[PDB]
Each structure stands twice: as structure tokens, then as C-alpha cells.
Enzyme design. Structure first.
Site, mmCIF file in Angstrom:
data_model
loop_
_atom_site.group_PDB
_atom_site.id
_atom_site.type_symbol
_atom_site.label_atom_id
_atom_site.label_comp_id
_atom_site.label_asym_id
_atom_site.label_seq_id
_atom_site.Cartn_x
_atom_site.Cartn_y
_atom_site.Cartn_z
ATOM 1 N N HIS A 64 -9.134 -4.368 14.308
ATOM 2 C CA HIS A 64 -8.945 -3.551 13.101
ATOM 3 C C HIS A 64 -9.662 -4.093 11.863
ATOM 4 O O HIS A 64 -9.848 -3.361 10.895
ATOM 5 C CB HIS A 64 -7.466 -3.242 12.785
ATOM 6 C CG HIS A 64 -6.529 -4.390 12.929
ATOM 7 N ND1 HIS A 64 -6.105 -5.146 11.857
ATOM 8 C CD2 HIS A 64 -5.860 -4.857 14.011
ATOM 9 C CE1 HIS A 64 -5.216 -6.030 12.271
ATOM 10 N NE2 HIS A 64 -5.051 -5.877 13.573
ATOM 11 N N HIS A 96 -11.235 -4.559 4.100
ATOM 12 C CA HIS A 96 -11.117 -3.155 4.509
ATOM 13 C C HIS A 96 -12.332 -2.504 3.867
ATOM 14 O O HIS A 96 -12.655 -2.806 2.714
ATOM 15 C CB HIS A 96 -9.850 -2.488 3.969
ATOM 16 C CG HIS A 96 -8.599 -3.177 4.393
ATOM 17 N ND1 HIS A 96 -7.861 -2.791 5.489
ATOM 18 C CD2 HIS A 96 -7.987 -4.289 3.901
ATOM 19 C CE1 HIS A 96 -6.830 -3.653 5.631
ATOM 20 N NE2 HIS A 96 -6.870 -4.588 4.695
ATOM 21 N N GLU A 106 -8.272 0.062 -0.260
ATOM 22 C CA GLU A 106 -6.908 0.511 0.027
ATOM 23 C C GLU A 106 -6.253 0.846 -1.312
ATOM 24 O O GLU A 106 -5.806 1.975 -1.506
ATOM 25 C CB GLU A 106 -6.161 -0.586 0.793
ATOM 26 C CG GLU A 106 -6.824 -0.837 2.144
ATOM 27 C CD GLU A 106 -5.870 -1.332 3.182
ATOM 28 O OE1 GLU A 106 -5.236 -2.370 2.932
ATOM 29 O OE2 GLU A 106 -5.749 -0.687 4.240
#
Ligand SMILES: NC(=O)OCc1ccccc1
Ligand SMILES: [Zn+2]
Length: 260
Positions: A64, A96, A106
Site C-alpha cells: 500500500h 501517500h 490525505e
């Protein structure tokens, strides 16, 4: 070993609540930071980021994101001050990011999405270990730093260059002597609020400290992040992009500013 969550259409953020009901909880992250509503808090003590003795060990593609892991068996790299009571030890950092420069972060700032977001994860030493810490409301402190595309971040290049060796899920590589101080912006001004992990199990154990000043990385640097794979070796290739959870309801929370 039986998790099946991800960022695809069929197992993405809108599906997580089925296996992790806390996904619809009272202090979920990330959130949108409304800069005009965040209030300056004079009670906040100075933030202390002490990474001089940080000792990195390895970089891992976990399916991930990729985690740069640190040796946290001794009191070395620690975060303290600001809204925190106690000392929090650095255990890993990860990012991310998006498929395009206009998305990837995010947290958002007045609904603005940055190209990426860096998370430096620290656990409260009073709980003894990371596993115990995540079971506590004040178990973790995560320092969030936004990334925008422009000039290259020299201190990020060693990370970018090692990614070729951990293309797929489950791959890891030795990654010693990486200095996380090279990923910090000039200013430590920040916003803070009580929240959660942004990936399952989505535990509500995080004091979030999000820096106002983004760091700049080059288009070539983020393009390398986008060549990573969510899949394991020998599986259909699925580029590791858009591995971000969208903003969640603020509910009964206030975001405090350390400045102005
Ligand atoms: N994304 C996000 O919530 O980072 C913080 C974190 C803390 C502990 C374990 C994994 C991740
Ligand atoms: Zn994260």
C-alpha cells in the site's frame, strides 16, 4: 493475513467500513484543514523534532506504500513538545501520492489537495511498544508534511533511487544511514488535532501534527513513486498511485494552530 482492503474500485476507502467499522468513527483521519476556522492556541508548547541520532534500517514495499523503517529499540529519534505530553519515538515514515500532481495528499488545506503527503510515525514510549501504543488514544504522534511539485528535494533522492529495488509488494532493501532531517521544511508551524490511522485498522490513536509549509520535490522524483506496484512480483501490474484516503468528517473536533 486475511486483509483484502486496498485503493481500487472494489476494495477502496468507501468499502473499508465493512471489515473495519471504526472507519465511520468519531475521530477518523485525514480531515480537511479549514485555515480560517483553525484557532491559534497559545497553550501549545514549542515542537521538538530530534532526529540527529535517527538510524534507518530498511525500506519495504508493503503493498500500500513503502515504509522506511528505523531502529526504535533505544531512545534516539524523538518527537516531543507541541501538543504532546511525553516522548514519541520514530519508527517509520512513508508517503501517500497521486496519479497526477493535483492529487495525492490525505489531509487537505481549504480543500486543496497536494501532490503527496509524508507521514513520520512515532509511538509514545510510556506504552513500551508500538503494538501497545496503538491501543491507546494518545499512543502515536504522526508528523504530516505536504509535498508539492517544483524544485527537487535533495534529501529525498536516496529514497527515489532505491525504489527500483522494491518495485513489488513484499520486497525490501537495506536502507541504512538515511537522515530524515533532509525531508523537513524550514518552518515547523503546524496544525494539530486528534485522529486516527488513515489505513486499516484505522485505530483512533493518533495525535496529528500537520506542518503548514510543504516541501518541494521534482516531477521526476514523484514520477518514480508512481512506477511502484501494489501487486507482488509475477502478478498483473497495478501501479501504486492514489494510495490516499479522502477527507473524513471532522465531527466533534477542533483543529488548533501553533501560529498566528
Ligand atoms: N497513514 C497513517 O495513518 O500513518 C500513520 C500510521 C501509524 C501507524 C501505523 C501505520 C500508519
Ligand atoms: Zn500515512
Amino acid at each position: 493475513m486475511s486483509h483484502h482492503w486496498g485503493y481500487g474500485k472494489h476494495n477502496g476507502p468507501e468499502h473499508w467500513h465493512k471489515d473495519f467499522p471504526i472507519a465511520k468513527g468519531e475521530r477518523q483521519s485525514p480531515v480537511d484543514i479549514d485555515t480560517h476556522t483553525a484557532k491559534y492556541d497559545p497553550s501549545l508548547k514549542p515542537l521538538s523534532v530530534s532526529y540527529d541520532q535517527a538510524t534507518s534500517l530498511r525500506i519495504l514495499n508493503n503493498g500500500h506504500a513503502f515504509n522506511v523503517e528505523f531502529d526504535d529499540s533505544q531512545d534516539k529519534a524523538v518527537l516531543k513538545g507541541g501538543p504532546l505530553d511525553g516522548t514519541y519515538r520514530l519508527i517509520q515514515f512513508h508517503f501517500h501520492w497521486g496519479s497526477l500532481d493535483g492529487q495525492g495528499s490525505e489531509h487537505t488545506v481549504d480543500k486543496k489537495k497536494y501532490a503527496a503527503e509524508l507521514h513520520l510515525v512515532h509511538w509514545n514510549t510510556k506504552y513500551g511498544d508500538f503494538g501497545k501504543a496503538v491501543q491507546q488514544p494518545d499512543g502515536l504522534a504522526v508528523l504530516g508534511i505536504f509535498l508539492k511539485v517544483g524544485s527537487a528535494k535533495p534529501g529525498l533522492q536516496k529514497v527515489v533511487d532505491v525504489l527500483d529495488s522494491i518495485k513489488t509488494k513484499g520486497k525490501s532493501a537495506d536502507f541504512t544511514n538515511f537522515d530524515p532531517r533532509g525531508l523537513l521544511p524550514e518552518s515547523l508551524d503546524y496544525w494539530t488535532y486528534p485522529g486516527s490511522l488513515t489505513t486499516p485498522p484505522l485505530l483512533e490513536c493518533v495525535t496529528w501534527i500537520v506542518l503548514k509549509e510543504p516541501i518541494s520535490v521534482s516531477s521526476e522524483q514523484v514520477l518514480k513513486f508512481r512506477k511502484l506496484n501494489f501487486n507482488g512480483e509475477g502478478e498483473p501490474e497495478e501501479l501504486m498511485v492514489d494510495n490516499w484516503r479522502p477527507a473524513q468528517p471532522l465531527k466533534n473536533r477542533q483543529i488548533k494552530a501553533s501560529f498566528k
